[PDB]
Amino acid sequence: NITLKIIETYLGRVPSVNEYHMLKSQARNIQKITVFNKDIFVSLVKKNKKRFFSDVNTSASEIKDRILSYFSKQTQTYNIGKLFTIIELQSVLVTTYTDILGVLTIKAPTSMEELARDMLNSMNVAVIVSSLVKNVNKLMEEYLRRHNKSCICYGSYSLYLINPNIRYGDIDILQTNSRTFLIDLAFLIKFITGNNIILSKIPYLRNYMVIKDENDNHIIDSFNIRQDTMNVVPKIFIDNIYIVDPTFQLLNMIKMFSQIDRLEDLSKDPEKFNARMATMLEYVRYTHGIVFDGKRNNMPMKCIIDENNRIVTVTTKDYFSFKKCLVYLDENVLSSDILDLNADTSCDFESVTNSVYLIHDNIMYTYFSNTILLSDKGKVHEISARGLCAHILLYQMLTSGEYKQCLSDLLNSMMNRDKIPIYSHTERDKKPGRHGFINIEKDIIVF
């Protein structure tokens, strides 16, 4: 009885033979959906709207209808696959919204621009969007203070909280519940801006997801990360928010300059990175007590590419317990070999490092993910050797190991350098997969 009644009420008709056989196992969730107080929900949506999208050309009735209209579309849906979608997405709203966006009701919680310019110029060594974003960013500002444990910021905004003379548009975050937050956000927007929003998952990116408007205009990105990772990610408390330690972000930047696309964007407008770089260098200088002074003293730990096997060997004995590091340029290959070594313990940090790290019979095994620049025939360009050190250093910090001497030396080695032309670069490995998505008005989910 209970099953049939529940389903009969939700669908607004006697469950058909097939509909009852399928939905029968959803009865529980379906109940929560039916019982859910829409009236309260409609209010929170309005309060959220007035506070973060006050300027959104709308008047209550419109919103109220959209919402009620949605929690009832099951009623006019006869395709079973569409039905599962509606019940899945209704469930995310019935079970999470209040805690994620609802809570947002009563809001509660330098001079080295010089040195930066130098390092940047020496690196600029080579041959050369929704209106809803202000609103979403103001919301994320409050969101980050109310969700210190599940959400944490990195990038421009983060550095902007340390030095206001930093522009910023996209507020970048890592979360333990990306899928949910974004679905809730997608819905909130959809309900306020009557016309559809689409979120999609990008392959070749680790646990990434974006919400775009009706016209493909990026609204906001996010990376899902598991508690394990969130816990070991080097963070700092600033303005009731968690920020990825600037020190760690500095290392990522070094790693990224190895990517051709980065250097290319650099030559477009060098001054961009100056302000960011400058801020991060100051933080390290002041916080860790690092001094700058042509302290190149054995920098590029020394890298050598194995052209045919797409493996770069990094001598690391003058810094770490392990003698060398084998940096693979093909993830699948690295994974296959680690499996050949019967190593079921590799340290993984998902999006943060974009690779696993393994230390076997005293050797480190890892993958890079960025292009590898070359000075000449078979020679790693200092920008990549330097980029390779940063990658390895990320691991040290994530494991609270030794990481100051070389971080200092690495940074100094970037000083008073001569632009060195790029002879060539390796191509990053192809990362296959489907571009999945969630089309709410079409009741479709494909991954």
Partner: protein, 286 residues
């Protein structure tokens, strides 16, 4: 008495360092077969999770019925936020606790070269993870099953596979064959004298690196495995601080220590105790 102390349990066939001559003379747990499958696939999928390959993947399981345990795998990764699309193909029907889920597609069809091509054109360009537990056994049956598994891989071109791997007995040899290169994962809670293992592979991009299996290899298999099942598996691992020191739980411990959890635990032993209980409570194994 017959107890023992080891650094680690035997995880893969190549680690078994001894052999005994098989004896034509030689399980005691309910749903043990389900626990066996559960652990090995949880271990498999988990490894793939760890190396970034599971995310956003479509998992194709052929010969999945009844597959009760899969509901546990699905719920496990679902709650971890790992995006996965499950596709189960079997000539027979699966457990109904798998129906009524958007992320899992149940197919009741006997697969053949023809059908495989079709679902690949359908799935593409999705990244495919293959799990084969197909069957019919006689050596002739096994060879046909293995030949079929090789067509699957070549058709679906999965990024990784877990295949049922049991070498034909030397005394029942027919001819030599080829299987995908990979690690041969041993299975805890497998029948008392089963020599069945799980061939784990992570592919590159060209060949599926086929290696030949001979009657001589079939003999080593039988020996090593008889030694494991007969000697090793029947021991109590005295240096294993756990409610159950049976070797099988020791082997299970090292598989579960690699599994991921949203819930935080002080020690690894607390995590394992949690997972085992969850697993047994689910499989309804006291």
């Amino acid at each position: 008495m017959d107890v023992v102390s080891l650094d680690k349990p035997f995880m893969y066939f190549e680690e078994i360092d001894n052999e005994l001559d098989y004896e034509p003379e030689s399980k005691k747990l309910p749903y043990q077969g389900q626990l066996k499958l559960l652990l090995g696939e949880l271990f498999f999928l988990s490894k793939l999770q760890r190396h970034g390959i599971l995310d956003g993947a479509t998992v194709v399981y052929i010969g999945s019925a009844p597959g009760t345990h899969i509901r546990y795998l699905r719920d496990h990764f679902y709650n971890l936020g790992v995006i996965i699309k499950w596709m189960l193909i079997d000539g027979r029907h699966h457990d109904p606790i798998l129906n009524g889920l958007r992320d899992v597609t149940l197919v009741t069809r006997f697969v053949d070269e023809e059908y495989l091509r079709s679902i690949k054109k359908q799935l593409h360009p999705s990244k495919i993870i293959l799990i084969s537990d197909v069957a019919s056994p006689s050596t002739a049956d096994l060879l046909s099953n293995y030949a079929l598994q090789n067509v699957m891989i070549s058709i679906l071109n999965p990024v990784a596979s877990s295949l049922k791997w049991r070498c034909p007995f030397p005394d029942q040899w027919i001819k030599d064959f080829y299987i995908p290169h990979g690690n041969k994962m041993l299975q805890p809670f497998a029948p008392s004298y089963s020599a069945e293992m799980r061939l784990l592979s992570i592919y590159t991009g060209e060949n599926m690196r086929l290696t030949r299996v001979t009657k001589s290899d079939a003999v080593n298999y039988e020996k090593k495995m008889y030694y494991l099942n007969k000697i090793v598996r029947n021991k109590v691992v005295v240096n294993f601080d756990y409610p159950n020191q049976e070797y099988d739980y020791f082997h299970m411990y090292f598989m579960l220590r690699t599994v991921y959890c949203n819930k935080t635990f002080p020690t690894t032993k607390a995590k394992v105790l949690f997972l085992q209980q969850s697993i047994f409570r689910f499989l309804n194994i006291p």
